[PDB]
Amino acid sequence: MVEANLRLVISIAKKYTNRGLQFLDLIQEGNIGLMKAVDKFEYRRGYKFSTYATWWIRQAITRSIADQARTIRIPVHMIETINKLNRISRQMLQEMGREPTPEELAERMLMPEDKIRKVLKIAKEPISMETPIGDDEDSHLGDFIEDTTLELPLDSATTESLRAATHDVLAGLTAREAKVLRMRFGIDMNTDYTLEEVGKQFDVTRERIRQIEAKALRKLRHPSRSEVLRSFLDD
């Protein structure tokens, strides 16, 4: 029975090799088609086996087209939405002579705008890093890309300078306050302690710890030492 009906299978797969993916894989899903069609068959009905099989095969492949065929996964529900959308769009094209409007086919479909928006935002596919953007093979699209991710050496050196000036100032304030604030803000280590934990390391206090913070602010506020950061004011 597998070897009975292979030719209908290829017939349908080539009827649908209107260019979704490729020939052979489709043909092979059709072969699984035929397997499960035969592996459960009701004979009592008295019809031809082949048609029962046929629609089972149709469903198998018409899924597998839509699961794969994009490196992005868009599950099936969105897929048939797009399908019926365009099935309506063709007839809007005729009976308008003109492209559609989101509100009009929203009315005709009876469903709301922002879905159509994000659909058409999502409906489109990726465009191949090495496409020939030049007139000739001048250079492909790769040159026209930025590494907008990593660093600025300017800002890196600027941040080093921030750090230098800051610990230079911390030398200028109280050892207690400066050290306790290096650790309270997590400087000079990996992790950031908090009010009570810094306290009960040091000692039990809570609110005079706050007032030690305000003290250090007054010590820093001090419009003679700001000038190592009065430009980092603008940083």
Binding site: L154, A157, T158, S161, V228, S231, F232, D234, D235
Partner: protein
């Protein structure tokens, strides 16, 4: 750039438009501004440079 003639040059010399060099010797200048105390930092230096 495009080139033209200096018919008075001392050949080991070269012609040069400035602003090109102004970009090309930039962080040099930044360091030297910081060194002379004029612009002690880099955005200060850069603002003076602009």
């Amino acid at each position: 750039s495009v080139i033209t003639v200096g018919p008075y040059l001392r050949l080991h010399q070269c012609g040069l438009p400035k602003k090109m060099a102004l970009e090309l010797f930039k962080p040099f200048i930044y360091g030297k501004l910081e060194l002379r105390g004029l612009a002690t930092t880099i955005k200060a230096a850069k603002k003076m440079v602009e």
